Amino acid sequence: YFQGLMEKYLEKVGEGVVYKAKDSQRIVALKRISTAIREISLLKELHHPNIVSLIDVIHSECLTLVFEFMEKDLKKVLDENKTGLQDSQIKIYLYQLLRGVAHCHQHRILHRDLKPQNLLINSDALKLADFGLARAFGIPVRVVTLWYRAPDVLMGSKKYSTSVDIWSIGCIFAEMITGKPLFPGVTDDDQLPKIFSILGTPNPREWPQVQELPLWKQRTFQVFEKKPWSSIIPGFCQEGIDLLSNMLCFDPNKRISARDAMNHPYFKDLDPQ
Ligand SMILES: O=C1Nc2ccccc2/C1=C1/Nc2ccccc2/C1=N\O
Secondary structure, eight states, rough: BBBSSSSOOBOOOOOOOOOOOEEEOOOOEEOOOOHHHHHHHHHHHHOOOTTTOOOHHHHHEEEEEEEEHHHEEEEHHHHTTOOOOOOHHHHHHHHHHHHHHHHHHHEEEEEOOOOGGEEEEEEOOEEEEOOOTETTTTTTOOOOOOTTTTTTHHTTTTOTTTHHHHHHHHHHHHHHHSOOOOOOOSSSTTHHHHHHHHHOOOOOOTTTTTTGSHHHHSSOOOOBBOHHHHSTTTTHHHHHHHHHHHOOSOOOOTTTTHHHHHSGGGGGTTTOO
């Protein structure tokens, strides 16, 4: 029994160390452990139905973050749906993903590590978690899968940009349709090649600012054409394709914002609540 500042707090469900827990009255979750204090300050700034809420903290000579409980993550939903999800659902999950991320961006914060397991869903409704690598606007930055990273980041971009999360939302959007990860580079060095092998290699003519990126000067890349959206995501509705393509364009200045994406005609039929 560990004393928080709000309450006293039990199965083991952890990784990477997360437990399940009982309040003196409600079910919570306990994340055990630098990037933790960060996570508190950032999470206090982020109160939103689509961001997993932090309810308490326990300090011992190990930090424990007390969170609202969440049945599962999207990593697990994709294992029950190996060929993708129902169009009704993709729309729902995607929309909530955009709503959480939009809230972050309005509040000058970037998740920077969006991926299915960092998206928790409760049995009712999906929420962003794990702000360990989040970037507050103006504060300097201080293992992982590279499958959802923006190509420009992978190429050495250091600049603050909301576009970085939209790339990740794109890869997740695509993953929900096929059931499979869009850019599963076999090693870390294969990630950019993998990306280009599907979306085509970017060219300086259309996107003049690759040339200014640190890994573009230090490396040449095999030149691919884009694979038609027809073979990447067979049979998906045109509206969806349009949206995904606007999430996945190479030029961070052309890439759609979370808020704009919420207004896309693909979301014509969904209740915005
Ligand atoms: O309910 C939760 N709220 C969280 C907030 C932050 C991180 C995790 C969780 C979390 C988790 N719930 C789970 C249920 C089964 C297996 C793992 C987790 C888990 N995490 O592994």
